Amino acid sequence: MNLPTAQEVQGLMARYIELVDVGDIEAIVQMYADDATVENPFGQPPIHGREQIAAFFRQGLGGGKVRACLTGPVRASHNGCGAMPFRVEMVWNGQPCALDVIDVMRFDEHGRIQTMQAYWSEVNLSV
Amino acid sequence: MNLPTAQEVQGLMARYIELVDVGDIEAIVQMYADDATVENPFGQPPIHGREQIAAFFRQGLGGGKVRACLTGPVRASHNGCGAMPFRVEMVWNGQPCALDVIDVMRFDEHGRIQTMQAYWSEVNLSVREP
Numbered sequence: 015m016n017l018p019t020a021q022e023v024q025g026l027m028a029r030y031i032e033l034v035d036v037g038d039i040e041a042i043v044q045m046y047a048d049d050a051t052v053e054n055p056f057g058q059p060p061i062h063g064r065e066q067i068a069a070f071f072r073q074g075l076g077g078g079k080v081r082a083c084l085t086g087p088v089r090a091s092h093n094g095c096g097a098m099p100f101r102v103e104m105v106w107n108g109q110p111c112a113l114d115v116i117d118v119m120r121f122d123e124h125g126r127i128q129t130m131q132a133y134w135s136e137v138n139l140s141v
Numbered sequence: 142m143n144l145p146t147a148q149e150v151q152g153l154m155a156r157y158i159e160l161v162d163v164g165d166i167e168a169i170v171q172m173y174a175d176d177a178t179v180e181n182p183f184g185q186p187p188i189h190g191r192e193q194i195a196a197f198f199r200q201g202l203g204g205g206k207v208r209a210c211l212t213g214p215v216r217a218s219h220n221g222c223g224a225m226p227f228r229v230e231m232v233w234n235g236q237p238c239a240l241d242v243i244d245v246m247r248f249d250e251h252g253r254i255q256t257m258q259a260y261w262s263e264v265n266l267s268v269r270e271p
C-alpha cells in the first residue's frame with residue numbers, strides 16, 4: 015500500500031480547497047507532483063509540471079476575488095483517487111457569480127496530486 | 142442524438158438518477174451502450190456489457206428499497222462528459238444507510254453512456270436514517 019488511504023485522500027483534497035479559498039499559491043502548487051498534469055477544464059489540452067501550474071493559478075487566483083468551499087463530502091477510492099464537489103464564488107461585471115465544479119484527483123506514491131480533471135463549463139455558472 | 146452537448150449532458154445524467162430513484166432497471170440499462178464499461182466502485186475491475194450491467198442493477202435495485210437524488214448540479218463538459226454528486230439511501234442488514242457518491246460518465250456518439258466511474262468507499266457511508 016505513501017499512497018494516501020481513502021482516508022487521507024479525504025483530508026488532502028479538503029486541504030486543497032481551503033488553499034484555494036485563501037489563495038495561497040505557492041501552497042497549492044506544492045500539493046502537486048513536480049510533473050503533474052492539470053485538465054481545467056476537462057476537455058482541454060493538459061498542462062504540465064509545476065511551472066505551468068503555478069502560472070495557471072497565479073492568472074486564475076492572483077487578482078483576488080475568489081472563495082471556494084466544498085458543497086459535500088469528498089469521495090475517495092482504494093487506490094489513490096478521490097472526487098469532490100465544490101462551488102467557487104467570484105465576481106462578474108462587478109457582481110457576484112459562481113461556478114459549480116467537480117475535481118477528480120489521483121495521488122502518488124508520495125501523496126502528491128499526479129493528475130487531475132476539473133469538470134465544468136459554461137452551464138455551470140450562475141447568479 | 143448525437144455526442145451530447147454540455148446541456149444535453151446535464152439532462153441525461155439527471156434522468157439517469159431519476160431512473161435509479163424510481164428503480165426502472167430495464168430503462169436504466171438501456172441508457173448505456175450496448176458494450177458500455179461500469180467501474181462501481183472505481184478501483185474494483187469493471188464490467189462490461191448490458192447483460193452484466195443489468196445483472197448489477199438487479200442485484201443492487203431489485204428489492205426496492207434503494208432512493209437516490211442528486212446533492213448538487215451535474216457538472217458537464219464539451220467533450221461528451223459529465224460528473225454529478227448524489228446520495229444513495231438503502232437499509233443493509235437492518236440498518237439504515239446512506240452512501241455519498243460521485244459518477245463520472247462519458248457518452249457516445251449515439252446519447253449512450255459509454256463508460257461510468259463511481260467514486261466511493263466506506264468513508265462515504267453513514268449508518269443513519271434517509
Ligand SMILES: C[C@]12CC[C@@H]3c4ccc(O)cc4CC[C@H]3[C@@H]1CCC2=O
Binds near residue numbers: 113115132134
Ligand atoms: C480560475 C477560476 C477560479 C478557480 C477555479 C478552480 C480552482 C481550483 C480547482 O481545482 C478547480 C477550479 C475550477 C474553475 C476555476 C475558475 C474558473 C474561473 C475562475 O475565476
Ligand SMILES: C[C@]12CC[C@@H]3c4ccc(O)cc4CC[C@H]3[C@@H]1CCC2=O
Binds near residue numbers: 207257
Ligand atoms: C449497488 C448499490 C445501489 C446502487 C448504487 C449506485 C447506483 C448507480 C450508480 O451510477 C452508482 C451507484 C454507486 C453505489 C451503488 C450501491 C452500492 C451498494 C448498493 O446496494
Ligand SMILES: [Cl-]
Binds near residue numbers: 085099227
Ligand atoms: Cl454531496
Ligand SMILES: [Cl-]
Binds near residue numbers: 099213226
Ligand atoms: Cl454540489
Ligand SMILES: [Mg+2]
Binds near residue numbers: 032035036
Ligand atoms: Mg477558508
Ligand SMILES: [Mg+2]
Binds near residue numbers: 047122
Ligand atoms: Mg514522481
Ligand SMILES: [Mg+2]
Binds near residue numbers: 035081082083
Ligand atoms: Mg468561505
Ligand SMILES: [Mg+2]
Binds near residue numbers: 159162
Ligand atoms: Mg424520484
Ligand SMILES: [Mg+2]
Binds near residue numbers: 249
Ligand atoms: Mg458503440
Ligand SMILES: [Mg+2]
Binds near residue numbers: 162208209210
Ligand atoms: Mg426522493
